[PDB]
């Protein structure tokens, strides 16, 4: 990247330039405006590699999935423990979400299997961690609290979307 070319003045300058390379190379203005936005979804829309919530059984596995993943893929990891309220509902929601956002990798793991026992008490469970490009993008302790007792996939989605964590349109 180095020199900027998409935002701020630099952005206007380069947008104006790329504009000319197209009209001769008001009506041409509007077409360009649509083409820029269009030109972006396509690059941000990647292949639907998944569709299911995968279970991680050990800490090594957790570390391996975020590490070896393509830097463009968003990874939603769910840390839970059976019996603990909210977990089941959240897991149900994730199964439906994973199926709607195939380009987003969804995972789940028992707090016990993490390799960090006490660190994850039922008090902070379920905890929802979200990675992307190898770095942690969000960390939601007691996620279940962000919704009403009875919550479904569409609620978890609205929620993730308002933190800008889900792709496509």
């Amino acid at each position: 990247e180095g020199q900027a070319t998409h935002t701020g003045p630099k952005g206007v300058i380069n947008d104006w330039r790329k504009f000319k390379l197209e009209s001769e190379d008001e009506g041409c203005l509007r077409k360009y405006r649509r083409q820029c936005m269009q030109d972006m979804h396509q690059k941000l829309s990647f292949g639907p590699r998944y569709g299911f919530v995968y279970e991680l059984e050990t800490g090594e596995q957790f570390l391996e999935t975020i590490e070896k993943e393509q830097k463009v893929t968003t990874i939603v990891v769910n840390i839970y423990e059976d019996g603990v309220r909210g977990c089941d509902a959240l897991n149900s929601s994730l199964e439906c979400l994973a199926a709607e956002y195939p380009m987003v990798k969804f995972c789940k793991i028992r707090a016990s299997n993490t390799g960090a026992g006490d660190r994850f008490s039922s008090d902070v469970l379920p905890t929802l961690l979200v990675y992307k490009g190898g770095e942690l993008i969000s960390n939601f302790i007691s996620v279940a609290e962000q919704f009403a007792e009875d919550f479904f996939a569409a609620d978890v989605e609205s929620f993730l979307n308002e933190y800008g964590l889900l792709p496509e349109r």
């Binding site: 990247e1 180095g2 020199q3 900027a4 070319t5 998409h6 935002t7 701020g8 003045p9 630099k10 952005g11 206007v12 300058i13 947008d15 104006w16 203005l29 509007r30 405006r33 649509r34 820029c36 936005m37 972006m40 941000l44 979200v130 992307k132 490009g133 190898g134 770095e135 993008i137 969000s138 960390n139 308002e162 933190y163 800008g164 964590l165 792709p167």
Partner: protein, 340 residues
């Protein structure tokens, strides 16, 4: 015959002297003194409002002093005054160019300006109601594009330009009252000190200049970046300011020290910074990168405190309210968002 090559050397030796004067007070970095300060909690802001109305990429926006109304300039050649609380549109102003680089909101709310590749700074009176045809004043003069502008009040506005200059105009007469020359490169941005007696500017010569408005000349020239400075913002107490540049680093400059107190960067970050803004207390430094991502920095500890907009590559510009209650983001997909 006269001479220049030698005159090119007195400049470097002098710069050389200033470097030493600075290096003489550089006993410690800010992070050193803040090493015991508790890091802030993970900053995670959420979308509260979505402003729908623009039909193209959003280039720049600016909050009104009431922390409720806000203006947005878009590639759709429109200027929109919104009411962030209700997401309702208050004004909509047709522009002549789609290439708007900046837009400003007078602290009084009576006016609003904008400009871009038209080398002109257009001013609109919102009270006389020039929404449809009228354009109060067109400030002509710069021989380069208009990068940024900020009102000092209703009859005074400062502009930065690609022509290497910055100008202080008298809205009424429409004349370029003062001319701030000195940069050797395109001026990309400017920031008014809170008291409006001083203002700072970033340019493509890799320097930031402190200017005296009332006196019309450069007080100091800051350096450190090896690349273009694309954004600059004054710190809340007026004694420092931040810069974002193509070298993928943010820098905190203190005015009294005449040098950088700290730098913000990470190895995973490789894009230029084209946007910077402080939180109300100044504890947070928000940075917009050319890859449409936004990072939230802990001004004190120099570590990422968070990510704004979850790295969805949808942030083209941003701004924080005077009351420090919310942040606004512009996007290439035509939507603006408010975050708490």
């Amino acid at each position: 015959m006269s001479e220049l090559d030698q005159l090119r050397q007195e400049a470097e030796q002098l710069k050389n002297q200033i470097r030493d004067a600075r290096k003489a007070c550089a006993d410690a970095t800010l992070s050193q003194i803040t090493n015991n300060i508790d890091p802030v909690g993970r900053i995670q802001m959420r979308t509260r409002r979505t402003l729908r109305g623009h039909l193209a990429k959003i280039y720049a926006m600016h909050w009104g002093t009431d922390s409720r109304l806000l203006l947005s300039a878009s590639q759709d050649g429109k200027l929109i005054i919104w009411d962030s609380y209700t997401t309702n549109k208050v004004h909509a102003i047709p522009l002549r160019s789609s290439w708007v680089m900046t837009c400003a909101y007078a602290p009084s709310g009576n006016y609003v300006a904008c400009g871009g590749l038209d080398n002109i700074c257009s001013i609109y009176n919102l009270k006389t109601r020039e929404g449809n045809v009228r354009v109060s004043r067109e400030l002509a003069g710069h021989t380069g594009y208009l990068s940024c502008c900020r009102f000092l009040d209703d009859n005074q506005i400062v502009t930065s330009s690609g022509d290497t200059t910055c100008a202080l105009w008298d809205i009424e007469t429409g004349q370029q009252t003062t001319t701030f020359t000195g940069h050797t490169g395109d001026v990309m941005s400017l920031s008014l000190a809170p008291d409006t007696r001083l203002f700072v500017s970033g340019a493509c010569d890799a320097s930031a200049k402190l200017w005296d408005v009332r006196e019309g000349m450069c007080r100091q020239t800051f350096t450190g970046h090896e690349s273009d400075i694309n954004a600059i913002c004054f710190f809340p107490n007026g004694n420092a300011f931040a810069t974002g540049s193509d070298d993928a680093t943010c820098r905190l400059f203190d005015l009294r020290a005449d040098q950088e107190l700290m730098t913000y960067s990470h190895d995973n970050i490789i894009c230029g910074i084209t946007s910077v803004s402080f939180s109300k207390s100044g504890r947070l430094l928000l940075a917009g990168y050319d890859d449409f991502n936004c990072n939230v920095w802990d001004a004190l500890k120099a570590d990422r405190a968070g990510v704004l907009a979850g790295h969805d590559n949808r942030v083209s510009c941003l701004g924080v309210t005077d009351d420090g209650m919310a942040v606004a983001t512009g996007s290439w997909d035509s939507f603006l968002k408010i975050w708490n």
